[PDB]
Amino acid sequence: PVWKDADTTLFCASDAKAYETEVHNVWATHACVPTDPNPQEIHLENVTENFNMWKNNMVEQMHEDIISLWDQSLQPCVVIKQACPKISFDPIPIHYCTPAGYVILKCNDKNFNGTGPCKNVSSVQCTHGIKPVVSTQLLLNGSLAEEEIIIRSENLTNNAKTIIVHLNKSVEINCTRPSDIRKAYCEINGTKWNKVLKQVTEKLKEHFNNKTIIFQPPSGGDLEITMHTFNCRGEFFYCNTTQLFNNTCIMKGCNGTITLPCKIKQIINMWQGTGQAMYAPPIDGKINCVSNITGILLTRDGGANNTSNETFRPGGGDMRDNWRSELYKYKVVQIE
Ligand SMILES: N=C(N)NCCCCC(=O)NCCN1C[C@H](NC(=O)C(=O)Nc2ccc(Cl)cc2)CCC12CCCCC2
Ligand SMILES: *[C@@H]1O[C@H](CO)[C@@H](O)[C@H](O)[C@H]1NC(C)=O
Ligand SMILES: *[C@@H]1O[C@H](CO)[C@@H](O)[C@H](O)[C@H]1NC(C)=O
Ligand SMILES: *[C@@H]1O[C@H](CO)[C@@H](O)[C@H](O)[C@H]1NC(C)=O
Ligand SMILES: *[C@@H]1O[C@H](CO)[C@@H](O)[C@H](O)[C@H]1NC(C)=O
Ligand SMILES: *[C@@H]1O[C@H](CO)[C@@H](O)[C@H](O)[C@H]1NC(C)=O
Ligand SMILES: *[C@@H]1O[C@H](CO)[C@@H](O)[C@H](O)[C@H]1NC(C)=O
Ligand SMILES: *[C@@H]1O[C@H](CO)[C@@H](O)[C@H](O)[C@H]1NC(C)=O
Ligand SMILES: *[C@@H]1O[C@H](CO)[C@@H](O)[C@H](O)[C@H]1NC(C)=O
Ligand SMILES: *[C@@H]1O[C@H](CO)[C@@H](O)[C@H](O)[C@H]1NC(C)=O
Ligand SMILES: *[C@@H]1O[C@H](CO)[C@@H](O)[C@H](O)[C@H]1NC(C)=O
């Protein structure tokens, strides 16, 4: 035993083939180390420890990882004049491990909303395979809750704090652009989507005191925040998630396949801050991705403590809460 809450400089590990150039590998061979050959996680009997993912520093430290991954690897056309070669792109799991004198604690309490104490703690040396997808409004290719749906928020009462809806059922998404080049779409199972979405509203009313929950498309911003931007094979997609957030469809004559209009923007505003950048025309041929929806990035706006309704509009932008959704059950303690 003996430990104390502390921080340090972490290190990473990954199953990264040294021949492939799917950039996540090419970067995880020269910055990460091989995966733990034989790894054990030791449970701690009759012990309880408090966690909180919003003041946690593993998240920050991982953000400083993906930033260098994207500034090093993928390069733009545009005083900045470069060559913009088409590259390969496919994320891979990356484990996060403590050096010497420290260890990682893991909360496997079946539910657990993130901030607070555990009860079923365990001590690991590395995290686990965590895919660094950089996406907004919808969390894709993450992990899933092993019990029920959970809403994660710092201050649930606050009105500019982002919300996170960890799902217990992965909703398949399928986005394509075959053979204007950059005119794409995304097919989603409306049946699966709205079954799970009914569930999502039930939980939101469980936290918000049997109040009428309503989903609304974004107020107004740049397409980065108001339009589901993800990265597909080195292509930056933009999907008008307006048919996803409709409270009418919660019988009814809407439950089939929800095609969604998308576009492959060349001019994007970075998520690392400071400026914009332009890339290059799409690769000829079918460009598509098949990802799992697993989390949900909402920002209910305030001004309805009195009315019997609360409006929730999709959000995101600060990719930090993309990581929080995954390193919520981990804390780095030092062997004091
Ligand atoms: N200083 C300002 N300009 N403030 C006004 C904006 C406040 C709104 C805000 O603070 N929102 C959170 C942080 N923001 C996130 C934005 N995210 C993206 O553009 C993005 O994720 N694109 C993307 C997504 C997926 C892929 Cl695959 C590829 C690209 C940009 C940066 C910003 C930080 C603070 C300044 C601007 C807003
Ligand atoms: C604690 O978590 C582990 C791993 O998730 C699982 O076996 C079970 O939920 C709990 N086990 C014990 C012995 O409490
Ligand atoms: C999370 O659980 C704690 C109890 O440990 C509670 O005080 C807090 O309000 C909960 N927050 C949410 C968003 O469920
Ligand atoms: C997800 O959680 C909800 C809680 O309301 C539950 O009703 C549902 O059966 C769960 N689904 C799965 C697949 O665990
Ligand atoms: C935010 O919500 C929590 C939940 O109980 C509350 O305890 C905390 O004090 C709130 N903070 C403020 C400043 O209201
Ligand atoms: C999507 O989820 C299913 C189970 O819900 C899982 O078997 C599959 O591997 C996931 N796909 C990806 C790309 O992670
Ligand atoms: C994805 O959609 C394309 C065309 O819409 C289709 O050819 C492909 O089989 C689909 N894949 C999945 C897993 O739904
Ligand atoms: C949607 O999911 C259901 C499972 O409830 C399945 O039976 C149906 O074929 C799926 N439809 C589409 C278009 O994905
Ligand atoms: C909501 O109302 C139902 C009955 O309509 C009740 O069983 C439940 O306790 C209520 N919950 C909240 C959070 O108001
Ligand atoms: C999304 O499509 C709707 C119509 O379905 C339109 O009113 C809205 O302006 C579109 N959003 C963007 C960002 O173009
Ligand atoms: C999710 O994972 C699948 C399979 O690993 C991959 O094809 C897809 O591109 C991924 N999605 C994103 C947004 O990276």
TrEMBL record:
Annotated ranges, domain Human immunodeficiency virus 1 envelope glycoprotein Gp120: 2-78, 79-336
SUPFAM superfamilies referenced in this protein's UniProt entry, alphabetically: gp120 core
Main location: virion
The keyword Transmembrane is assigned to this record: no
Glycosylated residue positions: 46, 113, 120, 141, 155, 168, 174, 189, 210, 240, 246, 255, 292, 305
GO biological process terms, semicolon-separated: membrane fusion involved in viral entry into host cell; symbiont entry into host cell; virion attachment to host cell
Cellular compartment(s): Virion membrane
Entry-linked InterPro entries: Gp120_core_sf, HIV1_Gp120
Pfam family, one: GP120
Top-level taxon in the UniProt lineage: Viruses
One CC-aspect GO term: viral envelope
Keywords: Disulfide bond, Fusion of virus membrane with host membrane, Glycoprotein, Host-virus interaction, Membrane, Viral attachment to host cell, Viral penetration into host cytoplasm, Virion, Virus entry into host cell
Record bears the keyword Ribosomal protein: no
Disulfide bonds: 12-32, 77-84, 97-126, 107-118, 175-186, 232-289, 239-262, 249-254
Signal sequence, renumbered to the chain: none
Protein name according to UniProt: clade A/E 93TH057 HIV-1 gp120 core
Species this chain originates from: Human immunodeficiency virus type 1 (HIV-1)
Lineage, opening ranks: Viruses, Riboviria, Pararnavirae, Artverviricota, Revtraviricetes
